[model samples]
Target: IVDRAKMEDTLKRRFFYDQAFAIYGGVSGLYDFGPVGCALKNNIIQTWRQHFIQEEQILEIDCTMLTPEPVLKTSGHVDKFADFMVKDVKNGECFRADHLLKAHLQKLMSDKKCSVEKKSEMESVLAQLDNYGQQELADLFVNYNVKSPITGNDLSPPVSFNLMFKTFIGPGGNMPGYLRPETAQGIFLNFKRLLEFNQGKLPFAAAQIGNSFRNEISPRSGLIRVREFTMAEIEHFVDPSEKDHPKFQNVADLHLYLYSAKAQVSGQSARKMRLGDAVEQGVINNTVLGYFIGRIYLYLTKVGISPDKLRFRQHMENEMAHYACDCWDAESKTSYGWIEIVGCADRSCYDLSCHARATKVPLVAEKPYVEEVVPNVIEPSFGLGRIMYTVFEHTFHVREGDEQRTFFSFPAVVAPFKCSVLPLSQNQEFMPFVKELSEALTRHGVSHKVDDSSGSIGRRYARTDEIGVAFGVTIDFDTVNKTPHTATLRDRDSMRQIRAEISELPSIVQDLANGNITWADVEARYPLFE
Candidate 1:
């Protein structure tokens, strides 16, 4: 329930995304992660690898960001993959016309007078927005009287905003290329290679984590929408004849909050239903898509996104991509509203069929002597920056009593700074203790930073706390005396301090990180820092 100002502050300070190429005139909808931002993204990617690919046993692949023009032409990004926009007649201001209209229509639907049927129609049109041929969208504007951004003046006709970066490859400028609008395309283009890599498996999936470029019509909404962003996409190649996931039973009992087409038409929020129930009740069309959607909820929870803040929104008829049979978006409630961060789509043989048709490549697989056919794709597409933003927002806390002290409270596995090493003072005598402590922490697989700057002990601890450092080890005069080779260990959340011997530092922190040992537990066990 924070404001956009709060989010903007957090993004600037925590994400370390300084304006991209600040020295030169910067471009809108573009940003570069600083050192910490890059590390945070790396940590997020690593976690994603563990969650979706490694833990799920899906094969991970790295693909090129630069793609051939023909490939995208096949995927419809060259012509489609568009947003609707209109220019203001008064001030000549440009606006994403569909976005504005959708916002207005959603508000209209919120009114009690808006009939269930009208609301349903609105939902359907919103879902299939991208596919709304020129006339359909124009009809929406004309029929609804969607207005301008600032003034209440009536807006003009809507037009397509192609969301792909077109460029020429090499110096000749004759060969055309496009920055990949989505990572899933690469997996499709290399279907034969991946199928061969899988030894001709029918339902194999190849996942990729890479940067994707979209020449956004108008990239706004902070990290939720960006021109260049990181995407985690998977192409689950399965037989078109059977669209069910193999391990559906494993996640059958998982519960999800679903806003189905029918529910939207009824003007109801998403309903909570178990995957097994949803499948049996015919709410979900396929087991695989259902299973993945459930797993997505679990993963969002695991990565620190609050369970209450996430929703699985089924695409309305109008919102669903033309190639997708069914699609569910994993959206999180941010300051702006519920934003789509992940899309689980059942693209029924669209990708493989197109690539195979265009390139004449055998992108489809077949059993020896069995007739070959286009493989169905169940893609779980993730917008990593959005995930990063949501996790930060969810874990954010400003102690009710203490407004000055801010902490990210990131999950331990993904926390940027594992351990902090602080010397009590500039005394040369404490050097050995600090050095020994850093070495011991490192030996125990703890990454730590030594803060020896001439700042007050409280300020030093505060500095580390700001970046979500879990534990701080302070080497004081007691260490120099060697009476007890111990340092004070302070907890970030409670601000409670405990003392432990240098030799025991590693295991204690390791235990803390694993949730096996708590600061109170450490205090109860040792009488050192009372």
Candidate 2:
């Protein structure tokens, strides 16, 4: 893994991402994704579409981001959806109270003399930091002698800060609105229309993927905490009587770490358990939730996130919403510690009920078994920015050599560009092969780059690796000399090479990029090229 300093340098230098409004001295919470960043982000989102939307046949729709005040007020974002923040009394810098306290407690736990009993007490507090009220946080700060992390100044009492970006819809400021805090509300608002579209079915799901905004008090940790981000949310409507999924058996045997509420409260580690066993044993809430858990694990792992570094952690009683019957977070462990990238929550008739009561609309499904039943929404919400950032952390590595060059070991399916075509030298003879190969790749609809510049082949390979190109095709003397024109295909992570006919390489790479076949399969079929 690369250090933060070097990672930052590479990202900006290679135009992956950079702070928004850079020339104006930049903004802390906003960022702009450059070319590589854009391509990578697009590819990840497309893969997500295939994984969740296409696979499940979920009804997908795009909603307006500008939400009216009444719409949010009904959804309770007006009253809730706020973070407790504390300000530095001397310097006036604001910080999220929970985040500030967690950092302080973890710092204390690092001390050798910190007693086991005291450490346990702090750990419990850290685990349930979101549960604390303003009073509780203020008391904890005073007890721990906590101060501003930057200036070491005394902190003010915590206060609730609304995260929505406020605006007016009309020219005369008639209709007060907000840039939506989350995308779920729009789906809830259009419940009847969607239900009709689904043929009044009870177990249908509607998913949305779009930009959502949050006005953070202080945003840090690069893409982890941001002012605005893309959220992929699914509102799976299920009858309270039927909390089971039809495709449960598909991923039942899948195993992963489950950090239950009991485990966290009891100060125990996450248990490695099979999805089927966990759901049957009542460790998970139900089959639908369990199904999403397994599917999410597959999607994350499929896109290069290490399975060992990913875990499904159930939210503590106080950490979960009042309306939620159960909730779990799919967290990815990075240098910043375990960060939540997706939240799967069983919001039991909360949004529909609220909107129904707020307006005079009947947001209920007319089930043949029962007269009118408000369906429970099992939502699996994805934080795209967090997932994207974690992908970079999980795949990034430095080559063990004299230069210590960094590269991303991205999986072929999710990589921005599937492969790079490197013409072995400055020789003009290689130009025809290079153009010919590039055209073949384009014709096959495989995204790729061609490097025909004068540089060491090793250096060219490094450049391709930096951008996480999955495979590299080197067209050298061997390709020209051979009667059939054979070239070497290098795997990025393993650095293993396989020789195959030049004409056959495009389809082979397309298959690999589309995940139709594995590298092992290719290795077995083709001759190894030293």
Candidate 3:
């Protein structure tokens, strides 16, 4: 409990993020990041660009967030993209129907008084809750004897509720618009242009990184369930007959957690499986889908998601969208339980076909009478906010001997600052070397902070560590007194230091930030310091 308390307090005081409007009553599911949080978010997004867009050569595009009504209607969002909600009869609070039912069952199962047979029955129902229809969910409330989570009052019967935030596009309210629910729709609308840009190619992907709005019914889970957040989505277009990926073999040997529907129904844990086997056995549906899954695992782990806390969960028949042939979620286990940070789905020409019919245009991959061969889309959509939260939780650690001494062990690639410069004392003599180091680091294209705040040098270093600065450069008296100036570079995770000349250190830190060299390599090259 103390650790959880410390985490929450640190987040607020250190400005990770709290609420959007703290002066007045803050809005639910809306937040504003502080300096540390913003820098962290930007770093994570940059890593995403390098890992996916640059490495995969994906064509990146930016689309307007405001979308017209007919566009959504054509894409089936106006009719189908909705969640069922039940309200508290007393105070009019709302909860998603499936979520409410799942929570009730979870609570009941945790009771010691429950019988084995009853627990088994409840567990089966729990696993299939997401597949239930509106009426069926309402019936679940009755069967499970559920009431409002807070007020213990009766709950209204479940009803369909749309999640989009609506607005008017132009004056006189003639054209209805919405804050786009997902970035994928805009890509679908512009499929022809993207294909043209790719020289009418069948095996090309277009990606978009932007904000999306969900208007969640109840967003109690902080960053995990937010009203508006960032998304990085990729849509791989391939001919319906040709679903193989050239890069499939590169990632096939990677082994990761796979939570299949069969194993989930049988109440078994997620088992490790090779990506190649998952595809060959028809578990993943296609080569390209498996390739994306494997790539996704690589990216997540690179960004510091603990592999043990991550799993790919296959969507059950009813849980998957109607047009999707196969779907899987990359779920990260957090304090709030398993959260879906990414959704990978094989949508069988759904969006493009729908847009084609509505606009009366062929959204085919190849032009000039190679017609009727619509491309199937494989989508991998990432929830940026959820990923950021998961990384924060995963990399965070409290010191073994001192509970108050805590730090984030973020990888250099994504740490808010690659390194920090601190002088051993505020002595006038050390100021020149501090400036020299800062300028050298900047010349070498490394992001770092100079911490000369009003505090003990040790306290300032602790502050740098707390914000997850990957490395620390200390300007001790030895740095100025020695014939050639030298400083000690301290590793954030191990707190080990090595002495190196001041001029050479900037390049070393630069290489470290670029991932050109590891800390181990530097440790071996330089002499250890106390």
Candidate 4:
């Protein structure tokens, strides 16, 4: 069983991350990544770069975090990017109205005294929770007699709470600004430049990896909801009529667990379908959308997110972003529930058109075939913090019948350190061997460390495993004195030990870390040490 509290403590104990401020009171929904967390985040970003940017040849960009008020006003963040919230009349505490209503409806349905028809009605209303307006949600409180979950007080009418964090850019406070609500707006604002960079190509993509902000009425779950977070977004501009991807065939045959809009409306479970079939049957809008759906599935599973707990959930009509024509979220099931880590949407030229009209700038692609075209966008956006949190939870494990043994079974590709080099003891004799191995690891471009701490070998290994170091290289007397210089290589998950030549260590470790070869392959090549 995975204990969330225990796992969180282990993460903090290993310096993965902690509350931003400890001595001074720490703020909720804010955290600071330590060395281990930073390394893991960088590795995850690297993997994302390889899978999306390099593989698809997307032109990556870095945009400014500070946005002028006009940009957001045009993007609809100023007036409409909000959540319906209700306040406790007695205490003035605010809670997100939709979340509150949904929780109470679920509670009502689960109550022993709930009538069969009432339960059915509650379930129906819950299914359309995203479609409810502030008025509708406010009415639910009166009709259902809902009270504050925190204070048990009377609640005020539901009101829209804008989530943008506002600020001033310059000395006079004349330039109103905001921390960007989403990275896509920055990409949209740079539409003309990006198109020119691509020589006015209609089918080009621009990717950005950066921080975005939101002010939540209430943020309870750790990384699932945060005030500030890292975002990875790609905007693939295509000709409106030509939404079919050139490489559609590559991912068409791939299968996905799809919780579609229709399925949600009918209260049915997810169905497995091929990307191509889904597109052909109108389950997904187009090949471009389907292509990203398949890629998200591939990326999440590649980083150790369990496919059994992952699904692509289609957005209901009113649940989608204002700019989106169609949308789907890559949701991963964890202790908190199914949380969205990635959103892929067909934004039918809404962004470019909005910004263009807002600033009177030309944001169109011109080709000989088509005089002027406002290219449609297929965007795949990832919430990096959420994905990292989910990965940590899914890979966390405790040894059966041994609660003391705990480890994060992160895949090598995302593990903070690929391997750790340790000496059998604090003996000076092992120093030179450890130093040489460390230099070799550097040469092979492996993220590794040397552990010479005064502790038992098992304790050191356990510490390394806790922080998601995938492999352990132990230097012993036999390694330095034996005829052939060799050391023991231990696998973190299996705890199996194997011995191999020192000269072969670099390539072997690199291959294993990159996931090019498996333990079985290593076992067949090397002799078992213990």
lDDT, residue 4, candidate 4: 88
Q: How far is candidate 4 from the true structure (C-alpha RMSD, Å)?
A: 1.8
How do the candidates rank by lDDT, highest first? 2, 4, 3, 1
**Model 4 lDDT tens row, 328-354:** 999999987778899998899888888
Error at 468, model 4, angstroms: 0.9
Question: Cα lDDT for residue 181, model 2?
Answer: 82
Q: Which ranges of candidate 2 are over 4 A from the true structure? A: 425-428, 516-525
Weakest lDDT window of 10 consecutive positions for candidate 1: 397-406
Clashes of each: 7, 0, 0, 0
For residues 395-440, what per-residue lDDT tens digits would candidate 2 score against the true structure? 8888887797988888887777988998766467877788888999
lDDT of 4: 0.87
lDDT of candidate 1? 0.78
- Per-residue lDDT for 202-257 in model 1, tens only? 88889988899878776677677788998898877878777777778888987767
Provide the TM-score for each candidate, comma-separated. Answer: 0.89, 0.96, 0.95, 0.96
In candidate 1, list every pair of residues with a backbone clash: 124-318, 127-318, 127-319, 127-320, 128-318, 128-319, 129-318
User: Which candidate would rank higher by TM-score, 1 or 2?
Assistant: 2
